[PDB]
Amino acid sequence: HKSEIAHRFNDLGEENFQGLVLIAFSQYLQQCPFDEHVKLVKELTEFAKTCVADESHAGCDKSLHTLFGDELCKVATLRETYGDMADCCEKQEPERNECFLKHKDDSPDLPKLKPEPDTLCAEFKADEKKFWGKYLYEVARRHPYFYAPELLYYANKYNGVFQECCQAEDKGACLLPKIETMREKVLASSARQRLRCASIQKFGERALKAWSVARLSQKFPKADFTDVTKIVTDLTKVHKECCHGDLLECADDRADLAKYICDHQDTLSSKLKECCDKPVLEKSHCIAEIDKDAVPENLPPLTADFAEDKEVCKNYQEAKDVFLGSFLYEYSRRHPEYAVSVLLRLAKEYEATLEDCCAKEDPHACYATVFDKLKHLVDEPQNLIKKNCELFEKHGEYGFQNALIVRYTRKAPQVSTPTLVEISRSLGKVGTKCCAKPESERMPCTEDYLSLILNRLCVLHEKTPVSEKVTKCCTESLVNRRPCFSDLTLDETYVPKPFDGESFTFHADICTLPDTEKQIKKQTALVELLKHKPKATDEQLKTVMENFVAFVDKCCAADDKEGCFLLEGPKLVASTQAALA
Numbered sequence: 001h002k003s004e005i006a007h008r009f010n011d012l013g014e015e016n017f018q019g020l021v022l023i024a025f026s027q028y029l030q031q032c033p034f035d036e037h038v039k040l041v042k043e044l045t046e047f048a049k050t051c052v053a054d055e056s057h058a059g060c061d062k063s064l065h066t067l068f069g070d071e072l073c074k075v076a077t078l079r080e081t082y083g084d085m086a087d088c089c090e091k092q093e094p095e096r097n098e099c100f101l102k103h104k105d106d107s108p109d110l111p112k113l114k115p116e117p118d119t120l121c122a123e124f125k126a127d128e129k130k131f132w133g134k135y136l137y138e139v140a141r142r143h144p145y146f147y148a149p150e151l152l153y154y155a156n157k158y159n160g161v162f163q164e165c166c167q168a169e170d171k172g173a174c175l176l177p178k179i180e181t182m183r184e185k186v187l188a189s190s191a192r193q194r195l196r197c198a199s200i201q202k203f204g205e206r207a208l209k210a211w212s213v214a215r216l217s218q219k220f221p222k223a224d225f226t227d228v229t230k231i232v233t234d235l236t237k238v239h240k241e242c243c244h245g246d247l248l249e250c251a252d253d254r255a256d257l258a259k260y261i262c263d264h265q266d267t268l269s270s271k272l273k274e275c276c277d278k279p280v281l282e283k284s285h286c287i288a289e290i291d292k293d294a295v296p297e298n299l300p301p302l303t304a305d306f307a308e309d310k311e312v313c314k315n316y317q318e319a320k321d322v323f324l325g326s327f328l329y330e331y332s333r334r335h336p337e338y339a340v341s342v343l344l345r346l347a348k349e350y351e352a353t354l355e356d357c358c359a360k361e362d363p364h365a366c367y368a369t370v371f372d373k374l375k376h377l378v379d380e381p382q383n384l385i386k387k388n389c390e391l392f393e394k395h396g397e398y399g400f401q402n403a404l405i406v407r408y409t410r411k412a413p414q415v416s417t418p419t420l421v422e423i424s425r426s427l428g429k430v431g432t433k434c435c436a437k438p439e440s441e442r443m444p445c446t447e448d449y450l451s452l453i454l455n456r457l458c459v460l461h462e463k464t465p466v467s468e469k470v471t472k473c474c475t476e477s478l479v480n481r482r483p484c485f486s487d488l489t490l491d492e493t494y495v496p497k498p499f500d501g502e503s504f505t506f507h508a509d510i511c512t513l514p515d516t517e518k519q520i521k522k523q524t525a526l527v528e529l530l531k532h533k534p535k536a537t538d539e540q541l542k543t544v545m546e547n548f549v550a551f552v553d554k555c556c557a558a559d560d561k562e563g564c565f566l567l568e569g570p571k572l573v574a575s576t577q578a579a580l581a
């Protein structure tokens with residue numbers, strides 16, 4: 001189209017248009033305040049509108065990378081706030097856009113948000129619009145790769161929370177669960193996009209194509225390899241656009257593809273029609289989290305075409321990727337009960353087998369027992385799952401998190417305490433999310449969550465790396481990632497660097513803090529505990545813990561509280577090191 005900025009503006013409409021641009025500024029300039037971004041955003045909103053009314057106008061044919069970038073440039077505090085990011089502005093497109101993206105901070109250390117029901121309802125009634133885009137600021141800046149069309153849907157679900165709720169009699173009781181459920185779903189969607197972008201970047205497009213193949217085949221097991229491949233081809237393009245910070249394109253192509261899929265409903269899945277009349281964003285979200293359709297009844301056994309045919313090697317040498325793309329679709333549309341990562345890992349084994357049989361005298365011999373060999377690859381990861389859930393059953397989440405602290409602290413004690421804690425506290429939650437569903441959802445569940453939390457870890461680590469073992473697992477095949485991390489053992493090499501003089505001691509804030517912060521506080525002790533003596537007994541650990549709990553209990557029940565903590569504090573530091581040797 002002859003003016004892009006305005007091509008897009010009619011394409012999306014003033015609201016989602018302004019959404020998207022604010023998301024783009026807030027992911028560029030994570031540290032600039034929200035009124036700053038509110039301005040940069042109406043200037044390009046005005047200018048856009050101009051290119052709607054006089055398309056030949058001065059500057060309308062420009063690209064968005066020059067248009068956006070042109071405004072990052074009139075943010076005078078780029079040195080102060082982002083260092084050499086202001087050097088970015090000096091450069092020409094496409095380098096200035098190359099450079100701005102570098103400065104994306106995956107771990108921005110801004111204040112966690114404590115939702116206060118009366119302040120938020122007051123903010124909401126006072127300014128609906130500013131409230132909405134405030135939610136877009138907050139999430140987007142803490143989550144610089146958040147899926148932009150998806151963000152806009154959640155801002156919409158968010159404000160509609162403050163719509164149902166601020167009204168009601170007990171405001172808090174109405175708000176607080178709903179915004180907490182929504183907060184979990186948001187974080188989840190944030191990790192999954194973050195997984196996509198780090199796949200595109202550390203591992204090549206194709207690698208991501210496999211994921212969308214097996215996952216999309218599981219959802220629409222009644223559609224073509226052709227058809228599937230077609231969507232996966234537009235999906236990949238959307239997803240690429242976002243991660244590159246081309247949000248407008250992104251949402252627009254996600255719009256088209258959703259049209260497209262809703263157009264081909266029966267060819268794909270009975271389920272689509274539910275989704276197919278909701279407006280663009282509720283439509284796009286519904287389709288993406290859409291239910292697994294059921295496999296058609298009379299499909300032939302995988303064994304014919306991949307294990308008994310005698311043209312299996314020939315096929316496999318003429319068109320490897322195709323044959324293995326087709327195996328992946330074929331295997332996938334058939335086992336909705338398997339973790340996407342597991343399938344790929346099955347795909348890979350199948351491959352390495354053919355790579356070995358197809359060179360024998362009798363390949364058909366060597367390879368006709370493949371699917372059996374593959375049925376057993378699933379049962380060991382199942383082993384871990386179930387063991388990890390029992391552990392969670394007998395201990396409950398907080399207990400289970402503390403076991404994961406212990407384990408993983410030992411694996412990688414050079415990793416930072418915040419990271420071991422966040423990572424360990426989320427591995428705890430998977431216990432809650434998954435352990436209870438019927439197994440036909442369980443394994444996908446657990447492995448879904450695993451992949452997102454490991455990829456979280458990997459993204460923090462590559463920012464400031466401190467474990468070779470860690471960098472390895474992060475940096476080989478995604479498909480081997482949980483394996484590698486599950487196989488890690490204590491760094492028999494790590495020194496108990498003392499972390500001494502700097503000591504970890506409590507104060508009376510723990511009395512007042514919401515239950516999770518107390519946990520974080522305690523867990524950070526657990527970690528630093530282990531960092532200082534990596535060999536320490538399970539029971540050793542367990543008694544030391546039983547004491548902090550005694551210690552805070554006594555001290556949160558005293559009338560003067562910090563006074564207690566300043567008094568009996570030292571004696572826990574003595575009590576503990578002798579416990580330790």
Ligand code: PRO
Pocket residue numbers: 014015018129
């Ligand atoms: O929220 C809205 O709908 C207004 C109109 C477009 C930009 N903001």
Ligand code: PRO
Pocket residue numbers: 199207208210211212340341342344345451478479480
């Ligand atoms: O997209 C992929 O290929 C990786 C491997 C399994 C999990 N996801």
